[PDB]
Design a binder for this molecule. Structure first.
Ligand SMILES: Nc1ccccc1F
Ligand SMILES: [Cl-]
Ligand SMILES: [Cl-]
Length: 162
């Protein structure tokens, strides 16, 4: 198991514009195109990202390319964040994959108000952090996924992903 497999499992793969759990236009492996309600804006954004007139559809290789760039960006986002970096670098390898997953999903922004859980993770109070993390809109909106990431942080193992 590695970050790619893990997120591939959490985001799935779709080659045609779709709406995500929040109703926004996305494609591929959880690649958010726009928050706007205009399909045309989403298609324009898609073409800009791929470099060609896609007409709302991409190939698997294209999807995989967007994915690579998005994982990259997520980690880089973390390392560049003064509040995130120290936490991230205190964790082991599996738990670092759970931090990337959360960032991939919610953004560095979303994750920065998890201040209290961040502190518990840094202190390595696993069970405490797990309870704290569940107390969030994130867990109430996407419980099945949130449960998998939470277990991941609680246990430091890939059990939740089998
Ligand atoms: N949850 C989390 C997210 C990003 C960096 C570190 C973390 F602990
Ligand atoms: Cl791109
Ligand atoms: Cl879910």
């Amino acid at each position: 198991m590695n970050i790619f497999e893990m997120l591939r499992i959490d985001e799935g793969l779709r080659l045609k514009i779709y709406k995500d759990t929040e109703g926004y236009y996305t494609i591929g492996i959880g690649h958010l195109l726009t928050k706007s309600p205009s399909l045309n804006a989403a298609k324009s954004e898609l073409d800009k990202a791929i470099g060609r007139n896609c007409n709302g559809v991409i190939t698997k290789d294209e999807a995989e390319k967007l994915f690579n760039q998005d994982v990259d960006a997520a980690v880089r986002g973390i390392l560049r964040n003064a509040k995130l970096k120290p936490v991230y670098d205190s964790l082991d390898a599996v738990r670092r994959c759970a931090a990337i997953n959360q960032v991939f999903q919610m953004g560095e922004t979303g994750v920065a108000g998890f201040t209290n859980s961040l502190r518990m993770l840094q202190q390595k109070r696993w069970d405490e952090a797990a309870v704290n993390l569940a107390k969030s809109r994130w867990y109430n909106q996407t419980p099945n996924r949130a449960k998998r990431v939470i277990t991941t942080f609680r246990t430091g193992t890939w059990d939740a992903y089998k």
